[PDB]
Write a protein that binds this DNA or RNA. Structure first.
Ligand SMILES: [Mg+2]
Ligand SMILES: [Mg+2]
Ligand SMILES: [Zn+2]
Ligand SMILES: [Zn+2]
Ligand SMILES: [Zn+2]
Lengths: 589, 589, 161
DNA sequence: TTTTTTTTT
């Protein structure tokens, strides 16, 4: 038995990272300045430094984590005594455990060991408080004594009350003292296994996890997470007998990750290429041949515009795309790709969705009997992208429920005495088929689309796809067979890098409109409106929304190159893509 | 060792305000005269008077507050000995606490400290009575003795049954004596966080607060309030075990303020401008170009007329506006602005509203099994404005629920054995699209509204918005791009001061109609009757309702200028707006 | 004294007051015990007694614990024949709509009618009641907080319109 | 009762 306090302190103060910058030393300095009370340590770094120390953490976790925490606290306290009286104790969280076990393959032998499970977050409860050291008071005409009930031991998960007063050795009834009671933050969350690991013909399983102290509110529902902790059995109602000697299992989370400097460096050099826009466009759905104009439209929606928030109103900065095409034009294929490359996306279908499920659902809690709100698909997609396949297959009474969310980006509910307004800032991508399955060229556009003009005006771009056999069949057939043969197109940015690029652009880039782009947009909008009045029979209308669309598209093109201003070149591209949308719908320019 | 009783009396008596009038001395004088029993003290005043006094109260409020009550009570006692026999003790309340913490950021370290939280009140409980000192009689044939149970401390939040009789030392049965029991007023309320504070993709949280003594019935649901007090853990079934030693927190209210003398001067001098009405109109929706005539109608609805109450009937004092326009005419943008600038407004949509949610909903308590009502959207909007967007999309079974509210300004509830009639004196602002999306001029208004003719009879003014691409496209395009570029319109009233201006006018201004003014309305209304018979095919009928509506519009104009008298210039202005209403609806004169 | 149904506070309990409101619910006439008669079921006792001795029987129903005659505990059986009853009726009073403040729901108060006061008025009428307020007790034995109590109304005289 | 998805007169 050798003390690990010196080794742990030596590891923190002597470890050299990629640049030999003493990364953990910097983390301590950040911890002291911000009073973060939590430290994150990569497991592979510990193993590289001292393999014996890594072994002890994995197995002897129950009786070595407090030892390291105490040593770390003294080092921080010595570094800055002001840190004391503000933070009582610090936490050491280990990340990178080699022991990873699937949610469905958890057995009895894994209880009591530090393991890692990767899944999808589903439900998060409001933050509550847990008593870990009580303070009772034996009220009895002779006692008038208070005491901390659990002596030399943390309070168990089961609320237990003293039977014999330690101060007088007598029974009676005791009264809790909230003022002297010590509390710790407590949150309950539910994790679900990923859809790619569920066995065939079976519903996904669920596991209950517990977050405490600073770990509360570390993630939102729908996030992909990696949790490391100790499994344990759950006790709910042990007071009443009746067998039920079978218990569920829950998880005590010690460290949690969601979904770096090197990545930012990789992204920065990518935008240096003048043809970065073409590379991004060609990297959208590499398995689909052609449809270049469609690929550009989907790329713009991934980046989006710049939302504007003023003192009196706000203007949305999301781009909505609608695709109408004959069956077999692969429309669902790009939509599936978009839901996989976007940092945050939700995939829905017209037939399998309802008005309540898309925006918000009011459900009665059977435990208390009072109504409460449940987030819909659009609410869960706030700040992301919502995909609605088969938009024409849903009832018009249900489709009309998203008119407010698509423009005002808010959901208003007045039901069961509940008045609320939830943000739904999400970009909507929709696809569907014409009225008669396939497009009828002889018939006009009004009866082919079979959609009200109100929802049509809310879409920035509308593309009509027609499957016309011709001279391009041979090249299309060769491309499809090459995909089935395993051949892949090179010079394509991978999904993981592309997803990182999109997230960085949406966070640190905010283009501004210049004077040159202002004149070009104004001239085109005025000219576009004049031609619209010539033929008023078209279902589509040129409303002031289309003017907003040009600004959003112009910003999206600039954001793709990580530019700071909307130059003249970006304005031309916005006009060019708008011309194709107008030409496809039947309006010449 | 340092006593602050003298400092408290010194601070109350020797404090100089900005007017140098000893406001706190006047507050005590007002308290004694009206038996207020509650004193409001700003924290900033104490900080200027003495830093040590300010630091003590904000930190040690648990013990200093009872001490400060005695010094105030004695000073009031010597000021007026008759204060006794009516009020046993007074209350001192501190406001302006700088310890402001967000609702979602509350942690374990904040329990037991004086903090303040800003939120929205959503639920109020009927006033109840709480026991703080009980009296029991020992039911045992030897005792027949009455004793107060909690000796040397207050009754805790959990009622405790004495087990041993203090007077005789014998256990048995005890009977509560309500005659000698001490009671205190008790109320429960729920606070919800503001929509602007909710994180992306999450749902708003709630916190339960407790109001006691004079703090009961100090607010109504839907009001934004700032509440200060001490947090504590909630106990529901301490006797009943079952593990789950996790407790939710609740707030003990000590001072509550809903949502002022320099602003009074700031609004009175503003009305001195003879062009104040023009400036107010130009300040409505500054981000919307044009629509000058429709902006005037919205301003009138913000102020409204003066209700007339007779010995048998009441005359509605509110103005109802219906807006029908093509998609993309910014109908929803100004409705959002109206809901934000009005002192009390509720925003609802046609698809997100139900009949129960608009008027009242019954809720069955799980415990008692009793039905009780909940406030609907219209009830919460009483005394304010109710905004109903996309009124043409709501189901007719829910549309009939507002027919009584528009005309009778009342809501009748007869369900689940509960019969009541609620007041719904709220102005209704509604918007909707034409029957065929784009308005058709050649067809009449009846086949374009897609609404029953009955509901349109209750609307004072109806406006038609037309999106016709013409020479104004360039001006509109330039204006929109200016908004997106950060450019703002100057010489306009800010929203915060505009809301204060509207609230003052609706409270302290009651214009009176002159005899000469009545001549114009009576003469004008006669000419409408002649034209009604000339063209009886119009869907608009010249009823006595139009005569009543004309009076309200003139009264609103006078209230806009803070004038207590209705001159002739307001009557002609009311005539002009009615004429354009008839011109837009197709009745050309 | 006349007090609005919404302005009732803690200081008004135990004093004669007058409330004006609208009847909304009337319960069927029932009987209440003010002096019960108990028989000790113990193979030696066979004794009859009135448990609420020298005191009116309270609202809470409490059975005797020790036999006043034999001086021993056991089983006590109530005798409906020897007991004395009194007419009992429950009703709910709702405040007038004109008294309701803006944007609030009307309050309700529970009143008790006894003896000849039963069936004095029908639901939907306007009445003015007089009497003494008191708190409501349902299950004082059950612990678990609930230290707050509601207030009901005992009617001594009621007039209609 | 009231909001929701579902099979059923
Ligand atoms: Mg498809
Ligand atoms: Mg709208
Ligand atoms: Zn003891
Ligand atoms: Zn006794
Ligand atoms: Zn006996």
């Amino acid at each position: 038995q050798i003390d690990y306090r010196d080794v742990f302190i030596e590891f923190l103060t002597t470890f050299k990272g990629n640049n030999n910058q003493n990364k953990y030393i910097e983390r301590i300095n950040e911890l002291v300045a911000y009073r973060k009370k939590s430290l994150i340590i990569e497991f592979s770094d510990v193993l590289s430094f001292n393999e014996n120390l890594a072994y002890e953490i994995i197995n002897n976790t129950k009786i070595i984590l407090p030892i390291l925490e105490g040593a770390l606290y003294d080092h921080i306290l010595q570094l800055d005594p002001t840190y004391q009286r503000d933070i009582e104790k610090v936490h050491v969280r280990i990340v990178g455990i080699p022991r990873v076990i699937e949610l469905r393959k958890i057995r009895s032998t894994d209880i009591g060991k530090l393991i890692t499970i990767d899944g999808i977050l589903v439900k998060v409860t409001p933050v509550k408080e847990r008593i870990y050291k009580a303070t009772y008071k034996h009220i009895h005409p002779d006692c008038m004594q208070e005491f901390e009930w659990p002596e030399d031991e943390e309070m168990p998960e089961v609320l237990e009350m003293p039977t014999i007063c330690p101060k007088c050795g007598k029974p009676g009834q005791f009264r809790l003292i909230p003022e002297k009671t010590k509390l710790i933050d407590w949150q309950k969350a539910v994790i679900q296994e990923r859809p790619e690991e569920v066995p065939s013909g079976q519903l996904p399983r669920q596991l209950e996890i517990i977050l405490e102290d600073d770990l509360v509110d570390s993630a939102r529902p729908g996030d992909r997470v990696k949790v490391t902790g100790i499994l344990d059995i759950k006790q709910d109602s042990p007071v009443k007998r009746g067998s039920r000697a079978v218990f569920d299992i829950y998880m005590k989370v010690s460290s949690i990750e969601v979904s770096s400097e090197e990545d930012e460096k990789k992204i920065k050099d990518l935008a240096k290429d003048p043809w970065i826009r073409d590379r991004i466009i060609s990297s959208i759905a590499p398995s689909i041949y052609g449809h270049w104009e469609l690929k550009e439209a989907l790329a713009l929606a991934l980046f989006g515009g710049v939302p504007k928030v003023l003192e009196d109103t706000r203007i949305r900065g999301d781009i909505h795309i609608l695709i109408i095409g004959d069956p077999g034009t692969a429309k669902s294929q790009m939509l599936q790709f978009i839901s996989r490359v976007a940092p945050r996306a939700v995939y829905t279908t017209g037939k399998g969705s309802t008005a309540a499920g898309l925006t918000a659902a009011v459900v009665r809690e059977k435990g208390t009997g009072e109504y409460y709100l449940e987030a819909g698909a659009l609410v869960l997609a706030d700040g992301g992208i919502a995909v609605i396949d088969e938009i024409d297959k849903m009832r018009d009474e249900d489709r009309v429920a998203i008119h407010e969310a698509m423009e005002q980006q808010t959901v208003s509910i007045a039901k069961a005495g509940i008045v609320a307004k939830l943000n739904a800032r999400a970009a909507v991508i929709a696809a569907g088929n014409p009225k008669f399955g396939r497009y009828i060229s002889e018939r006009p556009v009004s009866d082919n689309i079979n959609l009200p003009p109100t929802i049509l005006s809310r879409f920035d771009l509308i593309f009509i796809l027609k499957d016309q056999p011709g001279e391009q069949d041979r090249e299309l057939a060769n491309y499809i067979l090459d995909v089935h043969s395993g051949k892949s197109t090179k010079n394509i940015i991978d999904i993981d890098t592309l997803r990182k690029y999109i997230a960085y652009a949406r966070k640190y880039v905010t283009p501004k409109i210049t004077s040159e782009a202002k004149n070009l947009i104004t001239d085109f909008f005025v000219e576009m409106r004049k031609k619209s009045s010539e033929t008023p029979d078209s279902p589509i209308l040129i409303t002031p929304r289309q003017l907003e669309a040009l600004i959003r598209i112009s910003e999206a093109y600039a954001k793709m190159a990580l530019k700071a201003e909307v130059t003249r070149e970006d304005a031309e591209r916005a006009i060019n893509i708008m011309r194709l949308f107008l030409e496809s719908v039947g309006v010449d320019m």
